[PDB]
């Protein structure tokens, strides 16, 4: 699956190094795909204290497992680690694309399931001594 | 969404109280939906020692977030808590249904995302002191 084929479906947004793409708790309205550059994900704690969680390299959907929840929200700050560009597709349009392209649907469901499996296994290892 | 509308799409399988529906590590081949009864999910530890995790009441997809991973596998034993009946739909057919019915697609993506959000938030609370 080459996600750059979806370029016609959305707008392009660019960020300078150190700019915030989304804040923790911001609503997820569009599906965001990192086209080029590097992002950092960082969790904000009760005291303002930030902890970096991961990096995102291209080409990937951001916070894929959170897009379609009830009251969908970014769980972390998303910050540009370097000059970056993102594709932003409206949720309703992204659904239409899923319905028309099996390879995309499969890719997306695979992305969400792999992220789920990873968090689930980690959670079991930390709670079953 | 009324999942019983998918009855024509699959076979029905019944289990007596105490029977095992799937073992931990069994491949996920069909999408399983609990129609009636009650299931128990139990994690099996290195020593044979079992711990119950949850109950499943009807009508729900079983292990929804695991269906579409690479090398998909049931993460827990699934056991009948009482006489139960399940609908079993072939994965390829379930994909076809998703592509043709928006309300189903949305329901499914919502189910997987809500389960993800819950495990993610639990994992953060246990690792960010």
Describe the structure.
The PDB classes it as transcription. Keywords: TM1171, transcriptional regulator, CRP family, structural genomics, jcsg, PSI, Protein Structure Initiative, Joint Center for Structural Genomics, transcription. It forms a dimeric assembly. Two copies of one chain form a homodimer. The first copy, chain A, has helices at residues 91-100, 102-127; strands at residues 11-15, 20-22, 30-36, 39-44, 50-56, 60-61, 77-80, 84-90. By secondary structure, chain A is of the alpha+beta class. Chain A has a single domain (1-129), classed as Jelly Rolls (Sandwich). In chain A, strand 4 (39-44) and strand 5 form a beta hairpin. In chain A, helix 1 (91-100) packs across helix 2 (102-127). Chain A is globular, with a radius of gyration of 15 Å. At the A-B interface, helix 1 and helix 2 of A face helix 1 and helix 2 of B.
Question: Helices and strands in order, then pairings?
Answer:
2 copies of one chain form a homodimer.
Chain A lengths: L10 E5 L4 E3 L7 E7 L2 E6 L5 E7 L3 E2 L15 E4 L3 E7 H10 L1 H26 L2
Antiparallel strand pairs in A: 1-8, 2-7, 3-6, 3-8, 4-5, 4-7
């Amino acid at each position: 699956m080459d996600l750059k084929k979806l370029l016609p479906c959305g707008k392009v947004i660019v960020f300078r190094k150190g700019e915030i793409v989304k804040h923790q708790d911001d609503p997820i309205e569009d599906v965001l795909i990192l086209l080029e550059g590097t992002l950092k994900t960082e969790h904000v704690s009760e005291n303002g204290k930030t902890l970096e969680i991961d990096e995102i390299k291209p080409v990937q959907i951001i916070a894929s497992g959170f897009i379609f929840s009830s009251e969908p929200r970014f769980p972390v700050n998303v910050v540009a680690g370097e000059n970056s560009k993102i594709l932003s597709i409206p949720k309703e349009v992204f659904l239409d694309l899923l319905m028309k392209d099996r390879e995309l649907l499969l890719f997306f469901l695979k992305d969400v399931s792999e992220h789920f499996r990873v968090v689930s296994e980690k959670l079991f290892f930390l709670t079953t001594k």
